[PDB]
Amino acid sequence: SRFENKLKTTQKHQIVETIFSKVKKQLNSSYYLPARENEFASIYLSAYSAIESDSATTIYVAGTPGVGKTLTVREVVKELLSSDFLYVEINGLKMVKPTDCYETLWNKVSGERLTWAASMESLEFYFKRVPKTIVVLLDELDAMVTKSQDIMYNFFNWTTYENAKLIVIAVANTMDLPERQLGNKITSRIGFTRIMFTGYTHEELKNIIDLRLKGLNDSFFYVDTKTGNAILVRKVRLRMSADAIEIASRKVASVSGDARRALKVCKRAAEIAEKHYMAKHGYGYDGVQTVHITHVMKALNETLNSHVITFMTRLSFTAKLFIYALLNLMKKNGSQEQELGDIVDEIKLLIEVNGSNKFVMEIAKTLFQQGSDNISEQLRIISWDFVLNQLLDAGILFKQTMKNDRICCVKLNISVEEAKRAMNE
Amino acid sequence: RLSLISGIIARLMQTEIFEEESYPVASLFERINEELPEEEKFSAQEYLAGLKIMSDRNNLMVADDKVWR
Amino acid sequence: KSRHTMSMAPDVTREEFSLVSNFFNENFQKRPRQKLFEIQKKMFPQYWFELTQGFSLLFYGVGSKRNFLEEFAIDYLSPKIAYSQLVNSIPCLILNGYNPSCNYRDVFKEITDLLVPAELTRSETKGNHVILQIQKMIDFYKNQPLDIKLILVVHNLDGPSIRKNTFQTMLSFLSVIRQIAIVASTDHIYAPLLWDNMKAQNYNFVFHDISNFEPSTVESTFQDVMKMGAEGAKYVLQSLTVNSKKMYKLLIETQMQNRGTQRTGVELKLFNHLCAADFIASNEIALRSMLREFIEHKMANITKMEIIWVPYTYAELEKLLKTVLN
Amino acid sequence: KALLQKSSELARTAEYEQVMNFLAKAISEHRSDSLYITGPPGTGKTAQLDMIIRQKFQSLESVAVTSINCISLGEPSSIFQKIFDSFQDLNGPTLQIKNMQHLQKFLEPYHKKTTFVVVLDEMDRLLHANTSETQSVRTILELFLLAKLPTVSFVLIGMANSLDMKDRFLSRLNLDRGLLPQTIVFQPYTAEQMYEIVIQKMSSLPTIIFQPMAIKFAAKKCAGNTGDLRKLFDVLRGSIEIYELEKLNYIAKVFSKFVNNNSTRTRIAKLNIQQKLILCTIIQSLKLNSDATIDESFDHYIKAITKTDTLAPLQRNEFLEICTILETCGLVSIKKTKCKGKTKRFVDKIDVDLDMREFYDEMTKISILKPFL
Amino acid sequence: ADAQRSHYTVYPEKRWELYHQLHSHFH
Ligand SMILES: Nc1ncnc2c1ncn2[C@@H]1O[C@H](COP(=O)(O)OP(=O)(O)OP(O)(O)=S)[C@@H](O)[C@H]1O
Ligand SMILES: Nc1ncnc2c1ncn2[C@@H]1O[C@H](COP(=O)(O)OP(=O)(O)OP(O)(O)=S)[C@@H](O)[C@H]1O
Fold first, then answer.
1. Which residue in the set E6, E7, E12 is minimally distant from C74, CB to CB?
2. Which residues of A belong to the annotated binding site?
3. Closest Cα partner for D262 from D354, D139, D325, D154?
4. D143 and D104 in contact (C-beta within 8 Å)?
């Protein structure tokens, strides 16, 4: 509103619009829908009746995140401005305290700021007195349910008044929410509309990608060979291999059916080809191009593959010495949770059960003193507080709090087999 | 008498051969004279009055006579 | 361990209990009760005379004393002392100790307003200043003309809130003042565990027996036993759908076909098929949803076959059979 | 075709006949009967009394009888403030609305000596408020005491969901005291009083509403678990737009959303044969009925796959993604449960909605999980 | 009637004189 005038600055020194820059502009998550096409009507025809008849209803939709329920209801009200209402985005998680939404409503009727106590008095005074038109979105309803349900009873008791000019639209995480958190007295007021949103399917996940790729798929750019700048000296084209787009769809529809996850894995795979193109020619920052299948093979795996295995083999020696002692106790006792003094008891013992091998002796010299035969005879090993602190904040280990530094228990936090498996290297 | 013949329809509503709470009129006749109890089937009005008593017991209904909801 | 238990008792409903209880407590031993009440009436001039000496009078004894204190404080003493000093009579401030909602702040806020606000004592109101504010009350009262202006009554001094220790010491400093007479009663058998020689120095208690074997009508109200669930879910079934009665009837039959424990219970699959047999349960979800309503009001249990069993006794379920289900 | 069904969605009840007998002294200006009106939920009971008082106020003599909703108080003061709002006056409000004895001074009227009855709406928020015998039962106790000597008495009409509240009353109060006795209940109307109101709420009648015996069919086969037939007409009003969208049909559409995956669409969730393997792997770890971590499951997943070599052992990171495929269909739920070593630390315990009876059918068709059982 | 409310207030010798000359003198 105000400060967007101050967020503008002047000197914009000719940023290089490369080949893959114009992809990510439309691969931004902003800018009729194919997948939830008919269900848009099922909201709207439920909404169009109450709007043009001055009533008060409730609409309940559910589903996993990434299915358009943030998007679709915005498209409902957007066309309605063409044809009497006040649009508010009452987000649940964007309220700091749960009562703070009450302030917004009384602010968004006349422009006044009181407490949440004094708002809902005049709100109740509004909802049963006004002679005769308010659209409200109660987003992310896991936030506003938590304390004692006294807030949630209000937001549907206002719907019961026949003289209440309000239209509520609830969007939740799960259909189960008025059956495993709310009471039945709320569950009578929620109704039984219950419009379910499923996931997306992999065919439609192809049909959502090309909507972003409408005017740019297999099109042509005008490029100077000196700076790498592209314009919608050569006239190059850039093509997108649809089969790699398909294998993006057949995974994301399989695991999650999430519309952000489908776009972003294409967005991550787009910039892999960006740096490899910049690697071969180096246009910096100041014949026919494509995106291979091998890009989305890596980037989809890049969502999965870890490093704690690679982290463990790149740790210190006494770190790998520590875990090897720790699995030795877990196969000695079978109790998966060993006392800290017994580990210090073991790393002493794991010295001399091995032979007089000078590597172990050059270890055993260093393991109790950093050379320096002057100062010696250390009880616990060198930096034993350090590696145990280093294994703690790494999340691999976990150690309960006790002022005794002997009988405080230690519990593993990652799978102990992969700890056994990474130890083998 | 009446408990046994409706009890067949219970496990035959446990299967999806009626596909819904809707069920056709020919679905009845292939579930009385086709199934096990012989000669207990009453007159053309009487077990048709017998299914009224089940409707009077509010467990199954009769509607859109080629089908019944 | 074959023990006879209170569950195996012929139980009594709400209106049946309290009415026949009211018959006994007003007609059992009526003649000797007022016959006691006339005997102890001659002690009333003796209490009046000792109470001029600022003695904290304490009444022990079996039975409730609540009726006796209110006759002795209100009607007898409080106008007798006003007539003997020479106009409204002496203000009586009772303290219902059997009422657990007594605090130290609220009753003392009454006290300083019952007592004289001759100075700005709200200036010393500041953060616990209660002992501070009463100390400024005490030393001023050491140099005043000796006359009672207030008599307070504390019923059931071993009560659930008055027996708290920060409240007890509060009353201790009140009793050393000569202007107020402290007539209280306790009922506990371990009531003299409450006071040391520090407090009784401030108290100078004396004792008298009153045993009229009263029923304690008001003092029974806050108290509860298992008379006051088998009786809890006895009322919810009286207001539900008509189908829930039938699906509980089919529940209660085969759960009492075999105390009502786990072993007499039924598996979920066959019970779904059984309540599918009488054209009642459509499937598992329609069964379970109107079975969660029996779960939400804790009217049935489940342990592991997948055994759902009713936690009421063998005798209770046939009572639930012939009365409310039928 | 819209305007006939645009108007579709919007003395009258056979329960109002009860309460005029229960208010038999309310037109003779005397103290009426003793009113504690309860009900199972959804039964119209909030608007039921609201129907009576609005028919009372539109009918009715000086006219001032007020009703306030006990939702956002948790405390018995401002109810006695809101009875003052029908006066439109000004006073010292705080002390007079706080103590039991302070309410008694408030009950001396001014203009023409019409008696006042209060209506306490939604009393169960204060019943099911803070701890019982400390504040809330005392609040219940203090309101129901009508021992006032003139006939100007604050007659209560309070309402509640769950019917435990009468046994919660003390034995003194249950000795025929106050608004106690007439525990007027409202059994949920099956179809025999609620549907006929829908008939009279079809005063403006379109030609094709639909076959009303199907509406009777709708009423009979909703009355298993229901209380609000206009709201269960609001599910007919959604299906009446289905016949507008296509230019108990919908209850049939809505139950198949809920019944399925256990019988049929379990294999829909596990098109991967390894997803069938990992689903049995969870249940084999459920022998140790513990906090079923994603690691202890991964422990039993490796130590079985080294014995039977059906596939190579996969990653833990793969094991993270595959169990989430089991998650989004609605089979297994994951929650961050409790372990209390250092802080409130969150390990993930799973729970399965399948039984071994609905397991054993779908695994005998595949003899590759038969080594694993 | 009111006894469940806590702390409600309400506003309802030839020999002995020879004691009186002795008692306070001692005190
Ligand atoms: N059918 C669609 N057509 C076009 N863009 C879409 C479609 N579905 C989702 N998107 C885009 O993907 C984004 C995903 O956001 P939404 O799915 O609307 O949010 P969501 O499903 O509510 O998840 P939440 O908000 O965390 S519960 C949208 O903001 C759009 O930018
Ligand atoms: N018999 C009826 N006559 C008129 N309107 C009715 C009737 N039954 C239900 N309604 C209407 O449908 C609504 C459904 O009742 P609900 O308000 O959801 O339940 P309730 O009124 O809150 O009672 P509760 O749940 O015990 S607080 C009522 O509020 C009325 O608007």
1. E12
2. 63-71, 139-140, 173, 260, 282-286
3. D354
4. no
> Amino acid identity, residue A396?
I
Q: Name the closest-CA residue to atom 5, ligand 1.
A: A208
CA distance D24 to D11: 16
Experimental technique behind these coordinates: cryo-EM
Quoted resolution (Å): 4.3
CB contacts < 8 A (C, D) = 66
Looking up tokens 């013949």, which residue turns up?
A: B5
| Residue numbering of the annotated binding site of D for ATP | 39-46
Q: Which amino acids bring their CB within 6 angstroms of ligand 1?
A: A 29-30, 33, 35-36, 65-71, 208, 211, 259-260
List alpha helices for chain D, DSSP H.
Answer: 2-6, 16-22, 45-59, 79-82, 93-96, 100-104, 124-127, 137-144, 195-200, 212-220, 236-245, 249-259, 266-269, 273-284, 296-305, 316-328, 357-363
Domain ranges of chain C: 29-228, 229-326
Question: What is the rounded CA–CA span in Å between residue C64 and residue C57?
Answer: 17
Strand partners, D65: none
Interface test with B, best of C271, C279, C283 (most B CBs within 10 A): C279
State phi, psi for A421 to the nearest 5 degrees. Answer: -80, -40
Which residue is it, tokens 């030795």?
A328
Q: Which residues contact D28 (CB under 8 A, 6 or more apart)?
A: none
CB A58 within 8 A of CB A137: no
Nearest chain D CA: its distance from B55 CA (Å): 10
User: What is the DSSP annotation of D239-287?
Assistant: HHHHHHHT--HHHHHHHHHHH--TTTTHHHHT-SHHHHHHHHHHHHGGG
- Asked if residues A176 and A142 have their Cβ atoms less than 8 Å apart, the reply is no
Chosen for mutation from E9, E17, E22 (greatest number of chain C CBs closer than 10 Å) is E9
Long-range pairs, B27-35, Cβ under 8 A, ≥24? B28/B68, B32/B5, B35/B8
Q: Report CB contact under 8 Å: D224, C290.
A: yes
